[PDB]
Antibody, heavy 214, light 214 residues
Framework: VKLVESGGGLVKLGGSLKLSCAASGFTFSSYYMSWVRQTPEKRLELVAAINSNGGNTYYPDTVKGLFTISRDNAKNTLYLQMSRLKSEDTALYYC???????????????WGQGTSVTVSSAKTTPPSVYPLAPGCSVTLGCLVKGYFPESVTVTWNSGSLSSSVHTFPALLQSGLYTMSSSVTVPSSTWPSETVTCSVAHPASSTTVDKKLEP | DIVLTQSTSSLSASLGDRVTITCRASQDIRNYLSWYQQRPDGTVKLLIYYTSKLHSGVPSRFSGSGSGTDYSLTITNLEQEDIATYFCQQGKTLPLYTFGGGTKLEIKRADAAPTVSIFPPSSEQLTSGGASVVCFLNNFYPKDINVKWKIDGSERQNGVLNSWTDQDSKDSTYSMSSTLTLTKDEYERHNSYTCEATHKTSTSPIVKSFNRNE
């Protein structure tokens, strides 16, 4: 039994998108199907569902205003038209087979692995990298803000200090992304010796190496 | 419509012992309650449907009970793969399916207070007209932790970003970064910046501060 979604990706505000889900390992046309999305606040919600043949579809909201579900039983394919999209539609979208016993459909017995959909009108912007000397064993930091799209990579020194390093996941602020990174090193001695966070953002072809400064 | 509350967002247990998760409905669902497991890699599997009916492919360790508006999921002899997030969902009527918020299940560690560091805005950022103050709280258990910023001894929750890492897999602790962002102008006006961590182990807050008028 399989469910593989695709169609996800970046799209601008107001944008449209058709997600697909290819099904196998069972008789597609025998089952109700549905899409479920997971917000980055990892709540789960049903987007839409549709019956065996395809004639009856079910929406919490809004019937064709936003989302439209459909299936091609000859092709073992399930579709979701998304249109007129907002930020808060940024989510991971799952294809799921619905299951009933006796004869309510109530649970979702099989799940695809999901397609990520990002909704942003942001322009590819490179990160500002700001070293973090404390104030005012020792811990240092590197702030990496104002970038798009995700992601970046931080490496400390080259980095000899592979461990004792934390990378904090990025968050969307003021339209762009912000993340940060720390490393802990021995007090005796620093800054007798230098420390660098090197940051890379391939989407803007930028590489920025930053010396830690008091 | 029909709301579903999982008392708890995360709970800590230990290998080979027993865990219970509870779901409270806002109205009767006639035993049409299911539970899912979401792995950290993002995969989702159905475990139990119709309250206790165990889905095939799933270990007997997992059992479910409940009725009316109250239901529980139980894992006996918890083992490593089970470290995951657990959602309940009622499927009483379609399309009004609802999901609980999730209960995160991690391995219990000895309780470690966080190591804490505060960082003034880098001079480079001060030329932007921007000014971010950052605080790192590293290596703590359990996840529950409240951090609040204070400028000149008065609280601010405005423009704070809080970011949690994954439970570090090698060592079972958590870390978080907290960022307060201001204009450079605001920054210069004030003098004392404070970052106050409150933890299960505190008892009183752990605080790390600094003063711009040296």
């Amino acid at each position: 039994v399989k469910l593989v979604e695709s169609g996800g990706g970046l799209v601008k505000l107001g944008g449209s998108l058709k997600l697909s889900c290819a099904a196998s390992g069972f008789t597609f046309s025998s089952y109700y199907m549905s899409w479920v999305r997971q917000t980055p606040e990892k709540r789960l919600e049903l987007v839409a569902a549709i019956n065996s043949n395809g004639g009856n579809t079910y929406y919490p909201d809004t019937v064709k205003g936003l989302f439209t579900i459909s299936r091609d039983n000859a092709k073992n394919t399930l579709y979701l038209q998304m249109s007129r999209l907002k930020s808060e539609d940024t989510a991971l979208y799952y294809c799921t087979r619905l299951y009933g016993n006796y004869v309510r459909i109530h649970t979702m017995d099989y799940w695809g692995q999901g397609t990520s959909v990002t909704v942003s009108s942001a322009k590819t912007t490179p990160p500002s990298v700001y070293p973090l000397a404390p104030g005012c064993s020792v811990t240092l930091g590197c702030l990496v803000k104002g970038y798009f799209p995700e992601s970046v990579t931080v490496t400390w020194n080259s980095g000899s200090l592979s461990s004792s390093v934390h990378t904090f996941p990025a968050l969307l602020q003021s339209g762009l992304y912000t993340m940060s990174s720390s490393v802990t090193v021995p007090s005796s001695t620093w800054p007798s010796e230098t420390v660098t966070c090197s940051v890379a953002h391939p989407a803007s072809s930028t590489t920025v190496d930053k010396k830690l400064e008091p | 419509d029909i709301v579903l509350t999982q008392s708890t967002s995360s709970l800590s247990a230990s290998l080979g012992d027993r865990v219970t998760i509870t779901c409270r409905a806002s109205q009767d669902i006639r035993n049409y309650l299911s539970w899912y497991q979401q792995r950290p890699d993002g995969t989702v599997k159905l475990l139990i449907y119709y309250t206790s009916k165990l889905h095939s492919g799933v270990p007997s360790r997992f059992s479910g009970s409940g009725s009316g508006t109250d239901y529980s999921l139980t894992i006996t002899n918890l083992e490593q793969e089970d470290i995951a997030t657990y959602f309940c969902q009622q499927g009483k009527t379609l399309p009004l399916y609802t999901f609980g918020g999730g209960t995160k299940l991690e391995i219990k560690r000895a309780d470690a207070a966080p190591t804490v560091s505060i960082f003034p805005p880098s001079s480079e950022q001060l030329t932007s007209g921007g000014a971010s103050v950052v605080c790192f709280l590293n290596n703590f258990y359990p996840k529950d932790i409240n951090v609040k910023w204070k400028i000149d001894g008065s609280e601010r929750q405005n423009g704070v970003l809080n970011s949690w890492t994954d439970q570090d897999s090698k060592d079972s602790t958590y870390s978080m970064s907290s960022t307060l962002t201001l204009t450079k102008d605001e920054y210069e006006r004030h003098n004392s910046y404070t970052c106050e961590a409150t933890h299960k182990t505190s008892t009183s807050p752990i605080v790390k501060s600094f003063n711009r008028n040296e």
